[PDB]
Amino acid sequence: SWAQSRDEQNLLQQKRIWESPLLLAAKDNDVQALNKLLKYEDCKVHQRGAMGETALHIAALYDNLEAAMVLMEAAPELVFEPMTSELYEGQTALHIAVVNQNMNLVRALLARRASVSARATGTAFRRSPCNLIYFGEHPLSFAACVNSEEIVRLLIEHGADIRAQDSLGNTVLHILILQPNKTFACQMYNLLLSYDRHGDHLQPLDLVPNHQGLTPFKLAGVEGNTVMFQHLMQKRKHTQWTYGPLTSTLYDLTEIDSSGDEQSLLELIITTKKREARQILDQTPVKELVSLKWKRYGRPYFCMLGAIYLLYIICFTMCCIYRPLKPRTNNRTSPRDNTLLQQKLLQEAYMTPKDDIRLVGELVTVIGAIIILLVEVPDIFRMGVTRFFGQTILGGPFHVLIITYAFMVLVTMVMRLISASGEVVPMSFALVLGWCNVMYFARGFQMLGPFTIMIQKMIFGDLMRFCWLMAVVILGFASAFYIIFQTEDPEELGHFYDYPMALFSTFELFLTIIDGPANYNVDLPFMYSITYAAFAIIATLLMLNLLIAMMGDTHWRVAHERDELWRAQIVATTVMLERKLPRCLWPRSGICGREYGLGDRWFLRVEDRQDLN
Amino acid sequence: SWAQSRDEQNLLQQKRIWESPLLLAAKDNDVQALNKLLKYEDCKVHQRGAMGETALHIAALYDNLEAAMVLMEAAPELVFEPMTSELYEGQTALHIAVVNQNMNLVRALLARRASVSARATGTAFRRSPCNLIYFGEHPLSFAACVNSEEIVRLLIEHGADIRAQDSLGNTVLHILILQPNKTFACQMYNLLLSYDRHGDHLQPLDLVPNHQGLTPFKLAGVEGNTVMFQHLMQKRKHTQWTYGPLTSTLYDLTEIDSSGDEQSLLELIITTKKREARQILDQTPVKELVSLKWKRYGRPYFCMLGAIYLLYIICFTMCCIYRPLKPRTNNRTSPRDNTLLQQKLLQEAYMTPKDDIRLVGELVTVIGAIIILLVEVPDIFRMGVTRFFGQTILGGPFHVLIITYAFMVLVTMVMRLISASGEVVPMSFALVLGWCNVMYFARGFQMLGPFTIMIQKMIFGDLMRFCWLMAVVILGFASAFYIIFQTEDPEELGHFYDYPMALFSTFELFLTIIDGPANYNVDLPFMYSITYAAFAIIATLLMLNLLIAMMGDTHWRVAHERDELWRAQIVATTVMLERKLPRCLWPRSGICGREYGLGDRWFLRVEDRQDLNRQRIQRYAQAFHTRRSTSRSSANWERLRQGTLRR
Amino acid sequence: ADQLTEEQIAEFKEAFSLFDKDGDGTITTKELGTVMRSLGQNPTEAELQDMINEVDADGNGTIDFPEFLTMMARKMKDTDSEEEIREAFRVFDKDGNGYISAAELRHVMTNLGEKLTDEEVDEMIREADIDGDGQVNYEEFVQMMTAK
Ligand SMILES: [Ca+2]
Ligand SMILES: [Ca+2]
Ligand SMILES: [Ca+2]
């Protein structure tokens, strides 16, 4: 019901034109009608429209020059007047002549000393999926987007500064990155730097952060404006000597390393949600860097780190398979042979030399559990809650498993202090999830780990929507078998002796695991065989084989979109490992400066073999 | 047999030409022969052809100008003579010269006061898959389809009205939509509307229905002539202001809503059989509409509807698993332990406070089942039987499951009142079909259910044709096993003690389910090992794995023509939900009019952002102006080239 | 416009629709004026009637599509006249709109096979498209046919 009111405003506009005698004449080039109406009678021209119009706004918006010039004689003050409220706030008619790319009207408007710094703060101008455009606020910025050069050149020469900011703090430079037409907006970025002839004490216009603190270089990284990102690097690279087909260039490396607090490119690349921004890692001053940070100094710690964790889970299992057990206590098998269990868990007996060893190993799990949680205390206290799940699916979607591994060990640590009975169930989940967590290290050892990328990509999506179609075909047929074997003696055919297990029975048939029931000695009821034949032709001949082909086709739509996932994930492994590990080891990468008298910036060189035979 | 009698009459024509001295001299322009034969002798020129020709018809049909001009002097009246019978009835020679796209004989024929109002009511002119054309009836309509402008224009200047109708009631406009050359016939549609200068007070020619009540606007929607549908949309949109690169028009939205009784577009789209008619839902005023009908007001009533169905089935299963049961009555297991069963179903035992709860829910399932039939009383009584199948396959192919669910509930309501024995056999069918019928809601709840289209699409066709070649290989081999273990004692290997179970036994070996018969303690006969390995090598190594690959290839021939079936099925779900649901909720879509001084028509506006396309607009302006994987992709163009080129 | 081909109508009709800003079917001085001076320059509003009355066949002050079409008949397309690319376009174009699309070219290649990926089809169209609408003209298609 929200945007419904927007249209209802907009139809209400046109009706005012169809009922005002002035404005309908202003909609057309009605020279004679506006001649006799204005100069003769005594009626005001301050008739605001449905969204706060003037006569001059409509004639501008319906691109009509000659009727607007006649209005200038009657209007000394309609030029300064803005539009009123709630969608188009503050927008004077100087804007509309700009958006229509000329009318030879800004000539006449600046002849009438039009203000060049009115700020269009209306609702239909904020950056949002609701509006179809984002042009900023100031009228100098508007001509930048429609790419009209001499209209821009005209606007500087009447004193419009190039350093205004919107509510978002974004400059007129920042608007050009967000535009959809890329190469046709490239020259404006050249031309606007050309009119920065005042070398300012503050910064030369290219270093202004917004309200979220972003230079227009880095903002190109987030939105993935690749062709523009190729162009902005061109100023920074400082070429050295050329030798035939060789060229040893030198890239700048200041605003893309992990040194500062701003995180500067790399954490901002992986924390995007946009898909196209991962394309930036193919570009040549960046692609070279992560190969250096991984093949040196990143790989061997990560392989050494996984080896320590691999001994952790082993030392957990060796203090898992030895538990304090005893014979069954005084209670005999009081249910008639449906109750077979025999040991029940010693109470407070450690008095052996052997359990002295186990108490050491049992503590090794406990201290290791606490270290994990102390890592994840500050993390959820800083990265919100939903923000953490924005981090999650890309390169850390385990990150509750390592938490819940630490959770269950603290559960079973309490469970033996109070020394209660049902202690096997926390021991179960911690044992499986401990081994499942070591698949996190599959990124290394070579590129024989995009399986764990793909097996994430497929356990969500494909298998997830397939289970609901399982979950009801399994539900009727299992409910049907329980009725048809209600009559029978379950001494033969113990599949279906009560309604809970007949579900779990049917789930075993549905994946063709349990053997399929038969007796061959008792006449089983006839409605079984008609029903069960109808089960198999659905279960293991239609539904399950459909799952393979649906698995098959979805595997090669994502072949090319597999290898970019891996090389994306290595960076997220890298930068997190840099961030949580202190220095005095694996130094700030690239060659230092200012010992060579070059500057406090640090650099790296890259050679290449050229072309043009 | 019918096509030969058409063909035999055609060869019967030519013999009449090869025997007549006149018409053979009329097939050629043998003016020396034509002059002497006519003026000298005393023979009429009323020599009828085998399909009832005249000699004047032949010169037009073999496009021969100078012969028929001589015929005008001898024959003042044969222009007025139509053709005779059963294929070309009433076809005058004015038609035939028009079909040859000119002869400049229309000059001469209209100089002989030829009627433009003759009607070709013949057999081979009616719309049919037997014929290869459809030109309509009137000579104005014949000039319409060959696209000859000055030939059209000449005919208006002789009193030819444009409002003729065929036996279908189609105007000349409706003929143009059905012509297969689409954009080359788009131009004629503007040309004829210019000759509607007399605005008649009935309707200005663009509103006239046919005998099945169809505007020419709607008719393109039925046949999927999108380009013509694109063009007729242009006269209905009404643009407002433009703002730089932005544009805000205002679409008409009158004949595309479910307001009137005419049903007006959308029921007529989904009720067709043609595949290419589903394409219209991509076009711009329609795709935007049904999204607004779905995301607002369409989805949330649909999901809230299905959850009531979910509590219905759950309430059925609770009054399914609790049945009145006694222990087995006085008859002991009289067959020798081949008869194990133990309860036999309490007769009239309700006298418990517990079963009154069961009495509650068992009624509710009966109450709801009546309501299902009450919805489906008028549907079967109006929409034929095969007509119901036309509704079925596209968007509603369940629709009998929910009928048969209503049977079996009423069977078990009967079956406990008489209280006969066999009450389990409806309770099976009334249970599995109930849970399967919730898969109707897989369209909704997200786009995570287009499977239910593909699992429809594949359970017919692929699995269906695979079932027979199962059903014979199994039918021999099951019959084979019964012969070889006929001799044996079934106390060991009790698979095959009798024939009808041996088929069911063999059916589990075919799908790799049962264990595979072996004993390892008692020697089984020496024909078993030869037969069984030969069975295994076909059934679970050749035949069954052939199914997966045959299922493999058919997944991605229909990767594209699956996703639009899903988006089509929402629209069909939407309208059916609208029709059987009253108003005073989810109002008639779009924005109402005539408060704004526009009229009773209702509208919606659409904003869109164009592009500039600077390199194309230079060359049109100068026409005004006065005095990567590139090598991979180009190899596919080469693969497009080499496969097409001549070969 | 003595003889033309379907494509030549269809593409010029797309031109006429793009050029007609208000969709009234006509072209006036106000309409031709703005879009011409949208492209950088500016005619001095006297060339505009001199543009129209040069070509307005009936002098009604408007340019309808037939007058627009016979103007482009004098600004006639070049001597690219063939027969097989004509036939190749009919087999490709299902609906016959004159613009072979993305999913259509996916469809025809699918019946030949070779399993084109969705990105691989986008690499085909974007290089073949000269003016940049993501759709291939008849004129654009022959330039991929003849030579590279
Ligand atoms: Ca126009
Ligand atoms: Ca004209
Ligand atoms: Ca097409």
Ligand SMILES: [Ca+2]
């Ligand atoms: Ca193109």
